[PDB]
Amino acid sequence: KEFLAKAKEDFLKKWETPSQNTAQLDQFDRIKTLGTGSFGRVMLVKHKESGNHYAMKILDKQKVVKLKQIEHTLNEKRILQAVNFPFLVKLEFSFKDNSNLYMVMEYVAGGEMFSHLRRIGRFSEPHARFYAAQIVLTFEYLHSLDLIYRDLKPENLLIDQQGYIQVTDFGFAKRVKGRTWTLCGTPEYLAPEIILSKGYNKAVDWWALGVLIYEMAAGYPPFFADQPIQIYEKIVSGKVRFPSHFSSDLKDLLRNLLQVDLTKRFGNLKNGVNDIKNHKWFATTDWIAIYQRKVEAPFIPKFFDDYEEEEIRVSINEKCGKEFTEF
Numbered sequence: 184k185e186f187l188a189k190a191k192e193d194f195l196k197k198w199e200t201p202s203q204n205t206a207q208l209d210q211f212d213r214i215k216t217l218g219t220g221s222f223g224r225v226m227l228v229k230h231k232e233s234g235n236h237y238a239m240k241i242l243d244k245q246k247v248v249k250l251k252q253i254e255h256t257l258n259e260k261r262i263l264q265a266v267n268f269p270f271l272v273k274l275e276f277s278f279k280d281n282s283n284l285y286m287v288m289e290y291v292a293g294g295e296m297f298s299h300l301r302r303i304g305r306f307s308e309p310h311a312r313f314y315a316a317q318i319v320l321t322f323e324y325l326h327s328l329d330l331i332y333r334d335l336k337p338e339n340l341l342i343d344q345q346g347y348i349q350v351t352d353f354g355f356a357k358r359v360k361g362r363t364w365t366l367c368g369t370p371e372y373l374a375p376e377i378i379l380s381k382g383y384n385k386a387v388d389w390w391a392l393g394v395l396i397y398e399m400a401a402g403y404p405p406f407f408a409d410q411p412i413q414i415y416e417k418i419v420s421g422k423v424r425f426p427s428h429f430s431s432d433l434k435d436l437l438r439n440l441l442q443v444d445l446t447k448r449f450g451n452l453k454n455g456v457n458d459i460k461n462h463k464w465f466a467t468t469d470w471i472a473i474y475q476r477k478v479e480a481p482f483i484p485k486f487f488d489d490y491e492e493e494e495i496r497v498s499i500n501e502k503c504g505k506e507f508t509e510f
């Protein structure tokens with residue numbers, strides 16, 4: 184109770200006056216390239232003073248502009264510097280220079296829920312429930328700050344060194360008390376009210392939780408087809424069919440999450456998230472023990488120079504200064 188009001192205070196202070204240039208490139212030893220994103224390399228770095236390892240995402244400002252990802256990139260950074268929750272990736276530092284934006288993230292030698300789910304095929308209900316519980320608490324947290332996530336899917340969930348989820352992508356997340364209109368997400372996870380195009384609210388996250396739980400437990404999502412139009416028709420007008428192996432409790436929870444009418448959808452009623460937390464399917468879930476990450480995860484990921492080292496070259500001339508003023 185009193186912790187949500189404190190969580191709200193801490194978020195609002197940071198949301199209204201975001202932190203900027205909290206570190207600089209010369210404070211990090213550049214070890215090697217971890218991978219490539221849309222806008223540049225992700226590099227393993229060591230903070231010289233603390234000796235902590237981080238994943239430094241390098242975003243070429245010129246490329247962010249060319250791909251029209253300015254607003255998404257600024258939005259994601261503003262949210263990440265303000266939020267604090269066990270299942271949200273942690274932005275430790277941010278800064279910018281003439282060429283680049285730098286998001287110095289907590290280093291997670293984990294796996295991706297997407298590749299893990301696709302390799303295993305499907306999760307048992309107890310294992311799906313373990314992951315689902317984390318998403319329920321995360322949506323509870325984000326919704327208490329009036330954040331709509333609206334991009335849930337296995338692809339946006341990393342599995343960390345302790346086998347817990349971290350939500351990794353906030354480009355699409357919006358701070359909004361009530362209704363909003365922007366079309367976004369991935370076809371298979373779109374809530375019917377998004378497709379119906381007369382506006383939607385935070386209830387779209389509870390729909391997407393239904394899609395995620397179904398996909399984890401079945402190994403495939405409830406609505407799919409060769410073309411996005413046929414998916415949209417099934418979402419708005421069609422019925423789900425549950426595999427025979429789904430428990431009665433799972434089918435009941437999913438009937439109330441995959442509820443086409445947002446006014447009857449669990450998470451969106453008078454009792455809010457408690458209709459989900461107190462559902463029979465979650466009877467065995469110790470919500471505090473999940474939050475405190477005291478539950479044994481069912482899967483632990485099995486975690487020198489770059490093949491060709493490329494140096495970072497920062498221009499002596501400022502690129503796209505006006506666009507990224509607030510970064």
Ligand SMILES: Nc1ncnc2c1ncn2[C@@H]1O[C@H](COP(=O)(O)OP(=O)(O)NP(=O)(O)O)[C@@H](O)[C@H]1O
Binds near residue numbers: 217218222240
């Ligand atoms: N916090 C992190 N800790 C460790 N490795 C990371 C971290 N973030 C990213 N990586 C690595 O960098 C790669 C590409 O970065 P990533 O953030 O996934 O790209 P993006 O621009 O966010 N888009 P995407 O590749 O679709 O996820 C990942 O596949 C990982 O190998």
